[PDB]
PDB file of C-alpha atoms and ligand atoms in Angstrom:
ATOM      1  CA  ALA A   1       0.123   0.185   0.259  1.00 48.07           C
ATOM      2  CA  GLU A   2       2.851   2.277   0.221  1.00 43.16           C
ATOM      3  CA  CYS A   3       4.009   1.543  -3.461  1.00 41.55           C
ATOM      4  CA  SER A   4       0.812   0.847  -4.894  1.00 40.33           C
ATOM      5  CA  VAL A   5      -2.121   2.389  -5.897  1.00 42.19           C
ATOM      6  CA  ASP A   6      -6.100   1.566  -6.585  1.00 41.41           C
ATOM      7  CA  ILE A   7      -7.643   3.425  -9.474  1.00 38.51           C
ATOM      8  CA  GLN A   8     -11.226   3.086 -11.267  1.00 38.56           C
ATOM      9  CA  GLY A   9     -12.183   4.238 -14.552  1.00 40.60           C
ATOM     10  CA  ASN A  10     -16.082   4.599 -14.858  1.00 42.38           C
ATOM     11  CA  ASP A  11     -18.799   4.909 -17.670  1.00 41.96           C
ATOM     12  CA  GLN A  12     -18.546   8.883 -17.004  1.00 43.89           C
ATOM     13  CA  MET A  13     -15.279   8.560 -18.784  1.00 45.55           C
ATOM     14  CA  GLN A  14     -12.760   9.767 -15.417  1.00 46.80           C
ATOM     15  CA  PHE A  15     -10.682   7.821 -13.085  1.00 50.19           C
ATOM     16  CA  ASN A  16     -11.480   8.625  -9.669  1.00 49.00           C
ATOM     17  CA  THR A  17      -7.709  10.278  -8.794  1.00 47.90           C
ATOM     18  CA  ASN A  18      -5.502  12.853 -10.805  1.00 47.00           C
ATOM     19  CA  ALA A  19      -2.389  12.368  -8.809  1.00 45.60           C
ATOM     20  CA  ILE A  20      -0.268  10.017  -7.705  1.00 47.85           C
ATOM     21  CA  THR A  21       3.020  10.222  -5.872  1.00 46.08           C
ATOM     22  CA  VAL A  22       5.672   7.329  -6.047  1.00 52.20           C
ATOM     23  CA  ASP A  23       7.778   7.591  -2.872  1.00 48.08           C
ATOM     24  CA  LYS A  24      11.537   7.071  -4.075  1.00 48.52           C
ATOM     25  CA  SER A  25      12.280   4.439  -1.564  1.00 49.24           C
ATOM     26  CA  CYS A  26      10.059   2.044  -3.821  1.00 48.71           C
ATOM     27  CA  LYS A  27      11.880  -0.214  -5.483  1.00 50.28           C
ATOM     28  CA  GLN A  28       9.022  -0.887  -7.764  1.00 48.02           C
ATOM     29  CA  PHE A  29       5.369   0.554  -8.442  1.00 48.85           C
ATOM     30  CA  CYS A  30       2.226  -0.934  -8.825  1.00 44.60           C
ATOM     31  CA  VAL A  31      -1.398   0.235 -10.139  1.00 45.14           C
ATOM     32  CA  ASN A  32      -4.361  -1.437 -10.020  1.00 44.08           C
ATOM     33  CA  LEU A  33      -7.227  -0.615 -12.602  1.00 45.11           C
ATOM     34  CA  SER A  34     -10.534  -0.956 -12.286  1.00 41.00           C
ATOM     35  CA  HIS A  35     -13.723  -0.492 -14.540  1.00 40.83           C
ATOM     36  CA  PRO A  36     -16.930  -0.276 -12.639  1.00 41.33           C
ATOM     37  CA  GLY A  37     -19.899   1.337 -14.437  1.00 43.22           C
ATOM     38  CA  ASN A  38     -21.398  -1.024 -16.927  1.00 38.12           C
ATOM     39  CA  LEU A  39     -20.099  -0.098 -20.754  1.00 37.82           C
ATOM     40  CA  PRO A  40     -18.133  -2.865 -22.933  1.00 37.38           C
ATOM     41  CA  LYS A  41     -14.226  -1.738 -23.653  1.00 33.91           C
ATOM     42  CA  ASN A  42     -15.081  -1.283 -27.145  1.00 32.23           C
ATOM     43  CA  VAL A  43     -17.308   1.880 -26.279  1.00 35.23           C
ATOM     44  CA  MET A  44     -15.902   2.983 -22.786  1.00 34.22           C
ATOM     45  CA  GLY A  45     -12.332   1.352 -22.705  1.00 32.91           C
ATOM     46  CA  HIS A  46      -9.920   2.712 -19.867  1.00 33.88           C
ATOM     47  CA  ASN A  47      -5.862   1.427 -19.813  1.00 31.03           C
ATOM     48  CA  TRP A  48      -3.790   3.379 -17.413  1.00 27.86           C
ATOM     49  CA  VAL A  49      -0.958   4.518 -19.613  1.00 23.53           C
ATOM     50  CA  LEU A  50       2.487   6.250 -17.987  1.00 21.96           C
ATOM     51  CA  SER A  51       4.451   8.393 -19.976  1.00 18.56           C
ATOM     52  CA  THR A  52       6.456  12.165 -19.312  1.00 18.77           C
ATOM     53  CA  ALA A  53       4.265  14.782 -19.900  1.00 17.39           C
ATOM     54  CA  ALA A  54       6.136  15.510 -23.123  1.00 14.04           C
ATOM     55  CA  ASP A  55       5.672  12.354 -24.858  1.00  9.93           C
ATOM     56  CA  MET A  56       1.861  12.178 -23.736  1.00 10.15           C
ATOM     57  CA  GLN A  57       0.546  13.602 -26.752  1.00 14.35           C
ATOM     58  CA  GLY A  58       2.385  11.452 -28.821  1.00 17.79           C
ATOM     59  CA  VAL A  59       1.297   8.540 -27.199  1.00 18.17           C
ATOM     60  CA  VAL A  60      -2.212   9.760 -27.432  1.00 16.06           C
ATOM     61  CA  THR A  61      -2.421  10.235 -31.052  1.00 17.14           C
ATOM     62  CA  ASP A  62      -0.652   7.427 -31.807  1.00 15.36           C
ATOM     63  CA  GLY A  63      -2.587   5.019 -29.543  1.00 15.73           C
ATOM     64  CA  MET A  64      -5.775   6.811 -31.004  1.00 16.20           C
ATOM     65  CA  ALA A  65      -4.420   5.119 -34.614  1.00 13.26           C
ATOM     66  CA  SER A  66      -3.893   1.347 -33.830  1.00 12.98           C
ATOM     67  CA  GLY A  67      -6.989   0.072 -32.964  1.00 11.32           C
ATOM     68  CA  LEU A  68      -9.071  -1.515 -30.396  1.00 13.16           C
ATOM     69  CA  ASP A  69      -7.460  -4.795 -31.198  1.00 13.78           C
ATOM     70  CA  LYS A  70      -4.276  -3.139 -30.350  1.00 13.98           C
ATOM     71  CA  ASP A  71      -5.356  -1.941 -26.863  1.00 13.55           C
ATOM     72  CA  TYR A  72      -5.176   2.112 -28.568  1.00 12.14           C
ATOM     73  CA  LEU A  73      -1.258   1.836 -27.798  1.00 11.89           C
ATOM     74  CA  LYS A  74       1.365   1.700 -30.931  1.00 12.51           C
ATOM     75  CA  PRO A  75       3.106  -1.546 -30.327  1.00 16.80           C
ATOM     76  CA  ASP A  76       6.426  -1.370 -28.551  1.00 16.90           C
ATOM     77  CA  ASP A  77       5.981   2.388 -28.292  1.00 14.52           C
ATOM     78  CA  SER A  78       8.761   3.651 -26.611  1.00 15.08           C
ATOM     79  CA  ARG A  79       7.626   6.259 -24.787  1.00 15.09           C
ATOM     80  CA  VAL A  80       4.797   4.412 -22.391  1.00 14.72           C
ATOM     81  CA  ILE A  81       6.749   3.802 -19.052  1.00 13.38           C
ATOM     82  CA  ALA A  82       4.234   1.361 -18.016  1.00 14.17           C
ATOM     83  CA  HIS A  83       0.507   0.411 -19.120  1.00 14.82           C
ATOM     84  CA  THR A  84      -2.061  -1.729 -18.452  1.00 15.87           C
ATOM     85  CA  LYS A  85      -4.256  -3.311 -21.152  1.00 15.42           C
ATOM     86  CA  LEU A  86      -7.324  -1.663 -22.298  1.00 15.31           C
ATOM     87  CA  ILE A  87     -10.495  -2.848 -20.005  1.00 14.62           C
ATOM     88  CA  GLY A  88     -14.115  -2.983 -20.048  1.00 16.22           C
ATOM     89  CA  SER A  89     -16.929  -2.917 -17.292  1.00 19.47           C
ATOM     90  CA  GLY A  90     -16.114  -5.459 -14.626  1.00 17.30           C
ATOM     91  CA  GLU A  91     -12.636  -6.088 -15.644  1.00 15.16           C
ATOM     92  CA  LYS A  92     -10.042  -5.177 -13.492  1.00 17.15           C
ATOM     93  CA  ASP A  93      -5.963  -5.048 -14.654  1.00 19.63           C
ATOM     94  CA  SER A  94      -2.437  -4.431 -12.845  1.00 21.21           C
ATOM     95  CA  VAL A  95       0.718  -3.023 -13.962  1.00 18.36           C
ATOM     96  CA  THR A  96       4.034  -3.059 -11.729  1.00 15.84           C
ATOM     97  CA  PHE A  97       7.183  -0.969 -12.876  1.00 18.28           C
ATOM     98  CA  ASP A  98      10.499  -0.281 -11.893  1.00 17.07           C
ATOM     99  CA  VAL A  99      10.484   2.704  -9.761  1.00 21.48           C
ATOM    100  CA  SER A 100      14.049   3.020 -11.285  1.00 24.35           C
ATOM    101  CA  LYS A 101      12.361   4.050 -14.920  1.00 19.73           C
ATOM    102  CA  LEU A 102      11.522   7.393 -13.089  1.00 20.30           C
ATOM    103  CA  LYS A 103      13.479  10.286 -11.677  1.00 19.82           C
ATOM    104  CA  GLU A 104      13.259  13.319  -9.687  1.00 21.12           C
ATOM    105  CA  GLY A 105      12.103  16.777 -11.243  1.00 20.53           C
ATOM    106  CA  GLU A 106      10.579  15.061 -14.195  1.00 19.68           C
ATOM    107  CA  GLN A 107       6.817  15.492 -14.995  1.00 24.19           C
ATOM    108  CA  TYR A 108       4.643  12.347 -15.580  1.00 22.25           C
ATOM    109  CA  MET A 109       1.279  12.176 -16.853  1.00 20.51           C
ATOM    110  CA  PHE A 110      -0.957   8.930 -16.755  1.00 21.64           C
ATOM    111  CA  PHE A 111      -3.802   9.164 -19.087  1.00 22.00           C
ATOM    112  CA  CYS A 112      -6.205   6.411 -20.991  1.00 23.18           C
ATOM    113  CA  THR A 113      -5.803   6.304 -24.813  1.00 23.64           C
ATOM    114  CA  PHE A 114      -8.887   5.141 -25.765  1.00 23.28           C
ATOM    115  CA  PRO A 115     -10.301   7.538 -28.445  1.00 25.64           C
ATOM    116  CA  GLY A 116     -10.940  11.109 -26.851  1.00 25.03           C
ATOM    117  CA  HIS A 117     -10.653  10.003 -23.171  1.00 23.68           C
ATOM    118  CA  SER A 118      -7.604  11.740 -22.264  1.00 22.35           C
ATOM    119  CA  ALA A 119      -9.159  14.771 -22.314  1.00 23.04           C
ATOM    120  CA  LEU A 120     -10.931  13.789 -18.662  1.00 23.47           C
ATOM    121  CA  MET A 121      -8.725  10.563 -18.379  1.00 20.55           C
ATOM    122  CA  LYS A 122      -5.431  12.482 -17.190  1.00 22.61           C
ATOM    123  CA  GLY A 123      -3.441  13.056 -13.922  1.00 19.46           C
ATOM    124  CA  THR A 124       0.247  13.843 -12.893  1.00 21.11           C
ATOM    125  CA  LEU A 125       2.840  11.354 -11.744  1.00 19.98           C
ATOM    126  CA  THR A 126       5.651  12.469  -9.629  1.00 20.45           C
ATOM    127  CA  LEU A 127       8.929  10.942  -7.853  1.00 18.17           C
ATOM    128  CA  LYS A 128       8.924  12.162  -4.520  1.00 16.55           C
TER     129      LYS A 128
HETATM  130 CU1   CU B   1     -11.010   5.178 -21.081  1.00 14.83          CU
END
């Protein structure tokens, strides 16, 4: 619970938190994403996708283009630090990543890459 967070994406196209802080002393960090609400993945899909603020736009744009079967993520996208898969209602998914992939003083953003969603479905992550 020191090195992990629980996040929900619902049918209102929103995350239930908008800022995550990763403690420097964590060796690894975990995000658990769940999808309450009742809409299917093809219509209201949420992933939890992490990049630098600088790369967010590019990741969203290219993810948009890659289609549903690719979880709206460009395959092998180098800008994606960590991601869950794309989930629909009733589903849940985890991602654990090495905290050493982060550095102090850089601004990270987490976002959903289902088309259109990142407008509302974004938040900050920073390494303290
Ligand atoms: Cu979404």
